[PDB]
Design a protein around this ligand. Structure first.
Ligand code: OXL
Ligand code: OXL
Ligand code: OXL
Ligand code: OXL
Ligand code: OXL
Ligand code: OXL
Ligand code: OXL
Ligand code: K
Ligand code: MG
Ligand code: MG
Lengths: 501, 501, 501, 500
């Protein structure tokens, strides 16, 4: 049984060994990274079903990121299995500043009047909270009376009741009892702070990642196609045209502009952390189902992200709600499910990947009956689309163990994946960029091979590689799909039904 | 635009020139057959859309039939297009005798009480009507009081009121005003006169046709599967196992046994002439629609026959009702529509074929919308069936100009035809028997090609043949289906969707 | 077992006894009309299943028409059943004139060069054919060179090769062997001869019919909504605004403007006679099916007309093609089928109505399985639509014997009819004008009653009237529908399912 | 905008004021019950959308349960809204015993060898854990080597490696690091401990609850139809035949016999607490979805229960996963969602009801598009079924603000509810047992009225009440359904589509 739903795991110190010490142990950080020991731990995550690692450039400098990418490349060799490399941008983050007097935090009561500063490069005081705004932008003219400033995963609400021109301060009322600590995330929902389409820091971070070697970029807080297009231009300028871009939908602007964002991007990450603060809490499931439906209809990749197994950061078992959440993301139609803190800085990273894999596997068993995606509704605008629809029908009518496609660019594999056939998809391709680039498509098992010389060669290759991989045995029926010749599926395509000898 | 519904045209003297004379001219039967001039007239029928010629063994002698079949082979070279050869059996007949005084006929009025004699070899009087029963069978014990004796295309009814065992006569009541003329057809519905399953006459005709080279046999008055199986036995005995049998459904027992008869036969001919006498006149459309539905569900051939354009025997234009009848047979799902006296004996054989072809082409354009048949009900149980379903869906999703099947036996062409794709079906086969055997399947264009060589590309050959025949040109999309490799005895396993060069 | 599909029978001399003579007996026309003997004949046509009588104003003076309608009014009292009264207009007919020297006809051969005169009031010669044009219109400028003049049901084609300004004659070439007899229909298709939207003759005829009392008008050669609108105006101005107009579609312009004609009209008459001459003969079935679908979708009345049982004009039994034509109009979804010459001018008027009834009743039994109409497509606008759809479902879900509606205007009967429930529709109504106005709606049995006093009253009346008509007995389930109060279903309507006690 | 998905809230000390002391105060149990102040707190739960109160007979004695039910009777009066009363049985619970020397708990490491005693009425030690088995059953012969004993919501596993015939103890290996505390839940999945169909303790609790007046019984650990029928016997014998029985499905036997249990019962409670310990944790969603589908198909009531907003027991905000969990239970086709510890003994009982109401309201808006249930599949074999199918189509075809049913038994409300019309369902009934008995059916607003005077009267009543309750105003389209002649207990056979 192959896991069809792909897992993105975020990496961090949780899997990393430093001087024989594990994360949280006394004097962990006083020790150099043990690359081999760390690489062996990361390999266990690959074996447990991680299909792509997320390097979150919100935390850690370039040397820390570059070192973690080098450790994953060693982990691939150890696992004898390849994974995708995904860079997640910092983007236009607002954080609380450091306090004067090195205070760590203060407690506030409902009804207190305090201020939020807009001046940059300054410290907070108990009564005047300063912001670290991405690119040191001045936000005073961008936030209107009646707006909400939310601190620390949306837990503490501050209502803007007046603005002070003299100090460029928001006069706010504490809406609920709570704590403001230093370096915590801040959200100001329903505003249009003019963060640039691509900030210098993100530009630098992307260029560094492209230099190291990546497959994917998840662009934080995408509001318009322009946020995607400015990243696409750098990928193209640097000869990294292979890189796929996932727009993170994290706020009302991104939801409002979803259609143009899907058009410009290679897929969507449903960033439920910022989204669950930026829109009403009970709307998140509506937006989750709507986004999965539209990305699937576009033949693109959707990643369902954030707090999926949150309790497993601290505890060895998920909650019943967390199991339901992961399971329903699969039934919704998600290509991939993501771990963030659970794999990056929790006590149980391998157990979190194992629990996600188990839920994802149990849920794929119910897609034929309960799946919310509806491939019958899709218009077939090309022969490769009508062939993918045919592959689906053949897997519904016959007991088909496996679909095998030979694909130069991944195009046939993506279209077959779009239709969600009740079969695994072995995608044979001829370069490592296309191979790693398919690792987040539903059901796709990418495998590197030599390009075939003829057509009849191609059907033999397809059956031999499937047999060598242990996906099929003598007497199993497979569906083989290729362009004729390979790479030309837009002009001429073929589907064969083959009994394995 | 190619006509998908097949036309069966009955041949007879209407197209035959004898020493420069036309049928009905003085001294016609005095001249010898002008074979070249007659073949030129038959070639015009082929060009106008005849796909199979019917040789009606109810009339003529074997020499006339063999000669006519040779005239057709010459016509095929003139038209550059082959047709199917169908033999229609005489079957069992009952005819009114000659009268004493050699009176031609008598007029009767409702309520008149008269007699029908069962004794063979006597003459009719006004008061006592004598019958010529096939085989001189004594039918006395087979017709009960309350049965109906019908005379002359069922235009005059005699009700059996009493039986006189002394004279073995039927005491009957004239039910309606009508004529009883000499040598007119008699029907006695809902009786089981023990006509043999295979009469000596039909044995002689069938074996003669088989020796000449026929593709189809239409068996008159099929009552049970035994009536089909006795003809199947002759085909098997003689090494003519490729010959297809169409059961003619003409009476109530045939309708009652329709399911077992379809299973035994290769197809049905809906014999509306006798059927319209043997069942209530207003029920024929019910049985026509029911038979077409059952035969399409069985994957077999149905022919709608008799009096489709009957007024064109004597007039240059059909009636509105005849146009409707032909049109609605197509909508009902018929493979083929038939001409009898209109092509065989009438003043306008060419015009009759042209009119039927025009009506059939106009109706096929409505099949996507108003089509009676529903391909969605078929069970995809085989490789060939799922592949035939794929073809249908490709043709429903894209503008497919042509479906090409490389078929040793014609099985794949028959399965694609059943699905009624919105495309012409080119069936490339490797022997003349298989090619002619496909001539009545809806939408199928049979074509003979050289058996594939080890180094032949079947797919390139398929496209090239379709281009040369003028069915497709550069930029058209076609579907090609084949059993790879080398069209062995390997089930169809491959579908290509191809933009034509 | 109630006949759901309605019959229009055209009246004429065929049913009229004159001085004890039947039509076509010697000296028939020399005798005065026997009103008692003629009414007894017409009453038999009612018992047989005629629902409406067509008075064709193309033939007969007002005195002949008036005596006929008066015969019909007497007929109902003999029958004890009412029927509808339909007036059909001469409209813009062209005819061949009388020939000089009392010659009845001439035969022509293909290639012959002759002339057609445009001057009115003159007689034809063999070499110069003269036209009787409606309202004595000059057509010389309104038909161009290359146009076709067709004589006698479009049997003989004359091709216009030149126009002679000096004589205002067409030089025409005979296109095929044929006869030009006196006072035969002439058609000049794809022309725009400026016939008034209403002609004084048609104005006058309509006003006469209204004085006698007509339920419907059929308007010949309707080209646009304009031709319907002018007839509407007269019906209102005379206090006859209750009169339903059927537009006759007979030509390309009527088909091209069908949507606007359907909007203005209450219904459509498919005039297959002129239609089959004015458009391609073999395309009539396409237009028939198309028109019936569109008129059902608008909730209006469609009549399939002309040559449905044509051979029964001369013979006591229809052809197989005629039986198919009637049967398939019912499957197409027609509300009504029509007899013209067969009931007006034929030897077998009563047998023609009996035959059409038998076929119609047989075909209605197949509507569930084979009905071409699709009630599921209709957008349920009003609550009246959704009530109608609900009644349809109740009759699909359970064994409903009958649907009873209490309707002031008939509007609930019209929407229930539109949905073609698997049940007879008893429409209880409160005047004779509304009750006859429903006689061409599919499945509707009109019945006069006095208005209800209470709601409990309205439901007890529906059931009592039903048991009294013999339509239902004890144990039969019926659906009752109504406005509350009766006749306001537009705002507030009710459906009840009741077992008869 | 009315909440169609029903809410069951468990009642407990969290809403109850003792003297002036809230729950978790210093010497809270050191006071009497402030009944009026408690009833005013419960009234706030009714206002926020609690449709039924659950009285969990696992915790408390008859006196505590009795007083709580009486406080609820007061809250209804304060709220001006009635609610259902549901008794939840203790059932065949296994718990850990009190410890030697009043020890609260001990912590264990993987691989540790210890013993579980089957002997009843003894204290636990660190090395030998004793069990408080319902009915004091000796379970020794019912658990084979290789079975698993689980403690505290299945958090700590013990693997039976051997059986000591001399002491009737299990030799177990600690499977994972964890804590054994006193009086914690114990599960022994995939065993057939011969607990009776109905234990004397459950018999007694049910009879006491029947005495106080209840609408529903939730039967813990239902294995077979016998477990339901033996409770039905008592509701019948005592003249409490109005009481509806929810089988709680929370072990493999329940799942295996689900069809026969649905047949015997009035509805199902999906008890995901025990169910997630008794079956593979990551399989609970499969059984939830299957159970909801089978119970809607039977036109019965399904409650999705346990840990739906768990974190709100201690925090003011639910997690993203908990929002997703409640939302998808609605999408799955649940009639009702439940709160246990969140309403019964947490810090935020009112905010818990409010959050569930908000998610449930938002989810019902997506049932027309993403709804799991499929009503086209139901057999239309009756006049009532045909009428219910006709109501659903009216609400699909038209913007219908409300369906009003005049129902003596509620049968017509239940059938209409089965079809999940896109509209609220006002159920006008003539006694208080029918009224309260409808309060867990999807979309049904029950309301008491006098049996009507006539057909015109009945249709007039229906509109007036709906207008009074503020459900609809002038220009609104409603569907009214009734059986005429009116009041004669006629099967519904009339539909009216009416502009108000
Ligand atoms: O950025 C994220 O992943 C989020 O906000 O969920
Ligand atoms: O997938 C591909 O490479 C194609 O388009 O043939
Ligand atoms: O034999 C036939 O074809 C018939 O009777 O129609
Ligand atoms: O058509 C054929 O020969 C086949 O596929 O069996
Ligand atoms: O006028 C007519 O009825 C016709 O042309 O069919
Ligand atoms: O049928 C009627 O007259 C009505 O109720 O609209
Ligand atoms: O009893 C319960 O409600 C449970 O176990 O979930
Ligand atoms: K006319
Ligand atoms: Mg025959
Ligand atoms: Mg439990």
């Amino acid at each position: 049984m192959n896991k069809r739903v792909k897992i993105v795991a975020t990496l961090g110190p949780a899997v990393e060994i430093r001087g024989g010490k594990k994360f949280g142990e006394d004097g962990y950080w006083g020790e150099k990274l043990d690359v081999e020991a760390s690489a062996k731990n990361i390999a266990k995550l690959i074996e447990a079903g991680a299909n792509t690692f997320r390097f979150n450039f919100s935390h850690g400098d370039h040397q820390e990121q570059g070192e973690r990418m080098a450790t994953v490349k060693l982990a691939e060799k150890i696992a004898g299995k390849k994974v995708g490399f995904l860079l997640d941008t910092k983007g236009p983050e607002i954080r609380t500043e450091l306090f004067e007097g090195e205070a760590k935090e203060y407690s506030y009561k409902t009804g207190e009047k305090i201020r939020v500063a807009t001046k940059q490069g300054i410290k907070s005081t108990r009564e005047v909270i300063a912001l670290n705004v991405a690119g040191a932008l001045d936000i005073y003219d961008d936030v209107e009376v009646g707006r909400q400033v939310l601190v620390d995963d949306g837990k503490l609400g501050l209502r803007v009741v007046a603005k002070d021109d003299a100090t460029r301060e928001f006069e706010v009322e504490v809406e609920n009892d709570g704590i403001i600590a230093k370096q915590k995330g801040v959200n100001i929902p329903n505003t249009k702070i003019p963060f640039p389409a691509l900030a210098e820091r993100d530009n630098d971070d992307i260029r560094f990642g492209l230099e190291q070697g990546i497959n994917f970029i998840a662009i934080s807080f995408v509001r318009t196609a322009k946020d995607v297009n400015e990243v696409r231009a750098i990928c193209e300028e640097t000869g990294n045209g292979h890189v796929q871009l996932f727009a993170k939908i994290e706020n009302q602007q991104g939801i409002d502009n979803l259609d143009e964002i899907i058009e410009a991007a290679d897929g969507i990450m449903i960033a439920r952390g910022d989204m669950g603060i930026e829109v009403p809490f009970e709307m998140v499931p509506v937006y989750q189902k709507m986004i999965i439906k539209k990305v699937n209809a576009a033949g693109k990749v959707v990643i369902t992200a954030t707090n999926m197994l949150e309790t497993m950061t601290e505890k060895p078992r998920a909650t019943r709600s967390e199991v339901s959440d992961v399971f329903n993301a699969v039934i919704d139609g998600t290509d991939a499910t993501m771990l963030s803190g659970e794999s990056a800085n929790g006590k149980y990273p391998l157990e979190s990947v194992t629990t996600m894999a188990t839920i994802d596997k149990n849920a794929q068993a119910l897609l034929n009956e309960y799946g919310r995606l509806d491939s019958d509704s899709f218009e077939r605008n090309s022969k490769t689309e009508v062939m993918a629809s045919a592959v689906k029908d053949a897997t519904s009518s016959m007991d088909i163990k496996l679909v095998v496609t030979l694909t130069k660019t991944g195009h046939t594999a993506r279209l077959i994946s779009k239709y969600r056939p009740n079969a695994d998809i072995l995608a044979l391709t001829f370069d490592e960029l296309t191979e790693r680039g398919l690792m987040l498509n539903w059901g796709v098992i990418p495998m590197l091979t030599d390009a075939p010389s003829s057509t009849d060669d191609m059907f033999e290759i397809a059956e031999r590689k499937a047999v060598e991989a242990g996906l099929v045995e003598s007497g199993d029926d497979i569906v083989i799909v290729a362009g004729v010749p390979v790479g030309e599926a837009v002009r001429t395509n073929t589907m064969r039904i083959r009994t394995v000898r």
